[PDB]
Amino acid sequence: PHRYRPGTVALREIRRYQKSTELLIRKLPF
DNA sequence: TCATCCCCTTGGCGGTTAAAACGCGGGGGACAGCGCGTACGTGCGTTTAAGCGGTGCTAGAGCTGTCTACGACCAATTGAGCGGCCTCGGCACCGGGATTCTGAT
Structure with missing residues (x-):
């Protein structure tokens, strides 16, 4: 499955x- | 009453006053790297109090009349702060004695 890196969701x-x-x-x- | 010297006083060219930019001895740690470290990022599962929609209860300011007395404005009265004058002393500056972190041993 997909997993975001600790930093992309924050900027989003x-x-x-x-x-x-x-x-x-x-x-x-x- | 309507031309030379020369002593020297008015112009511009020379002197000391109170701290820091080079010039040097130099070292504590910011930068970059090594290396250890653990709270939660993201995804899942599960549960709930806020959201939306009503539904029912209840009071207090908006606004409208009624009544009112200290606020504003006028003639007399009057009292101590300002400006000024006179008196008086607290501590910054001097110099010495006593005290004290700090580096080198």
Whole structure:
């Protein structure tokens, strides 16, 4: 099976959360 | 009342004051490499509290009338801070005595 290297998913999440401006903290606990 | 010398005073060319860039002795560790080290990256399995949609309960500011007294503005009154004057001393600078980390042994 496929397995990402420790560094690709991090940059992918960085790009995804820098392109979008949605709230990252849940509403009820906050 | 409407031309030479010459003593020397006004211009520009020469002197000391308080610390650091070269010039040198030099060494503690940043850089790069060796080498040991373990928390979780990613994927899986499993479980749950947030999400969406309602559903039912309940209060308190928005807004509208009623009543009000310290706030603003006016004539008298008045009191100590500012400017100034006079008095007074605390400690930075001097110099010496006592104290003290630090390198070399």
